[PDB]
């Protein structure tokens, strides 16, 4: 009895389907046209965005208000440190990795040919020079996928639909990262068909 | 450094609202803690070293530099069990982050836009806040606290923000004041609550 809508390309909605297949429970997913949920559905979250959460007599929106909900829930596989403090790391650096990183996504899919291509600058040499981080961890900054990774795979899986290609300095390093967690079982079951079509390996 | 004591600290706005929803939990848990009140022109040097953003609130308790109220908020409620303000359980934790989301993306937008828009606009945000939380009135008829039988972070949020409503030009009177009157007489009574005011907070209720 619970059903997530999903955008089949949004990344918020993308973040909330890794998560439900790491946990593997049973779910009802409808994809939704583009960014919306139906002007009919409006009972169901007065914003009408996606990723919007059914289970139940509870409705959920906001996919990090979702995805915690989820790992509080369905505890085993844990997506999260048990810890108070590395708890908060985790937190703000999904937190950051939004604010930071999520904002210049939305400048590059929402600007013109300029603004666009600034934002895309900028996103990519910040998104290099964490490279070191991965030369000593799996993951990142842990050596289990977490929710942080779940914020961080759906953008680098964009990196085509953004127009950003790594070369140079630090890309052998996120290019590593990104083969880890893009060859997950959990990660290739949480693709829409239109998220297959961005490569190669998964586009049918 | 801030981050080398063993006192946290807490680097705050004098009348910044975020910073008071972090003051009222500092006081609940009563933990010690140090608390800076900032000046935008000249902040601390260790806020400036530990937060790049440089914005308040942002709490130090040893290494861990934490910024953003609500995560600030649920680690003070990991970290310091006594009292509980969340609720145990998934769903019920579920719909209090879902609240405390909604009442800032609903009501502290207008809060901004009655602060600093043009008189047209602030009026319109003015009567739009002023009717939206008459309009919950009926809550407080059901349980003492918002959508709960204890105050919790939900409170935490709303609290600060009907605390300024004379700062913002509106006072309750009519259908729904009484509840609304009775539930701020409920939360700006309590020890924490007053613990957590800074001077100029007070005086926003000269």
Same mark, same amino acid.
């Given at each position: 009895?619970?059903?997530?809508?999903?955008?089949?390309?949004?990344?918020?909605?993308?973040?909330?389907?890794?998560? !439900?297949?790491?946990?593997?429970?049973?779910?009802?997913?409808?994809?939704?046209?583009?960014?919306?949920?139906?002007?009919?559905?409006?009972?169901?979250?007065?914003?009408?965005? &996606?990723?919007? !959460?059914?289970?139940?007599? /509870? *409705? !959920?929106?906001? +996919?990090?208000?979702?995805?915690?909900?989820?790992?509080?829930?369905?505890?085993?596989?844990?997506?999260?440190?048990?810890?108070?403090?590395?708890?908060?790391?985790?937190?703000?650096?999904?937190?950051?990795?939004?604010?930071? #990183?999520?904002?210049?996504?939305?400048?590059?899919?929402?600007?013109?040919?300029?603004?666009?291509?600034?934002? =895309?600058?900028?996103?990519?040499?910040?998104?290099?020079?964490?490279?070191?981080?991965?030369?000593? *961890?799996?993951?990142?900054? +842990? $050596?289990?996928?977490?929710?942080?990774?779940?914020?961080?795979?759906?953008? !680098? #899986? =964009?990196?085509?639909?953004?127009?950003? $290609?790594? *070369?140079?300095?630090? +890309?052998?390093?996120?290019?590593?990262?990104? *083969?880890? &967690?893009?060859? =997950?079982?959990?990660? /290739?079951?949480?693709?829409? $068909?239109?998220?297959?079509?961005?490569? /190669?390996?998964?586009?049918?």
């Amino acid at each position: 009895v619970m059903t997530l809508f999903s955008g089949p390309t949004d990344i918020f909605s993308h973040q909330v389907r890794i998560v !439900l297949a790491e946990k593997g429970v049973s779910v009802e997913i409808e994809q939704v046209e583009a960014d919306n949920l139906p002007q009919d559905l409006i009972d169901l979250n007065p914003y009408r965005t &996606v990723p919007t !959460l059914v289970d139940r007599e /509870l *409705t !959920l929106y906001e +996919s990090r208000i979702i995805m915690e909900y989820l790992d509080e829930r369905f505890p085993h596989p844990p997506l999260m440190p048990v810890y108070p403090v590395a708890r908060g790391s985790s937190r703000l650096m999904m937190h950051r990795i939004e604010h930071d #990183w999520y904002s210049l996504l939305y400048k590059i899919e929402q600007g013109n040919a300029q603004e666009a291509e600034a934002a =895309r600058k900028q996103l990519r040499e910040e998104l290099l020079s964490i490279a070191p981080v991965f030369n000593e *961890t799996p993951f990142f900054m +842990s $050596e289990e996928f977490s929710l942080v990774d779940c914020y961080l795979a759906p953008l !680098l #899986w =964009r990196l085509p639909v953004l127009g950003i $290609e790594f *070369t140079g300095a630090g +890309s052998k390093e996120l290019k590593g990262y990104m *083969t880890r &967690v893009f060859e =997950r079982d959990a990660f /290739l079951a949480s693709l829409t $068909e239109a998220e297959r079509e961005m490569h /190669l390996k998964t586009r049918s």
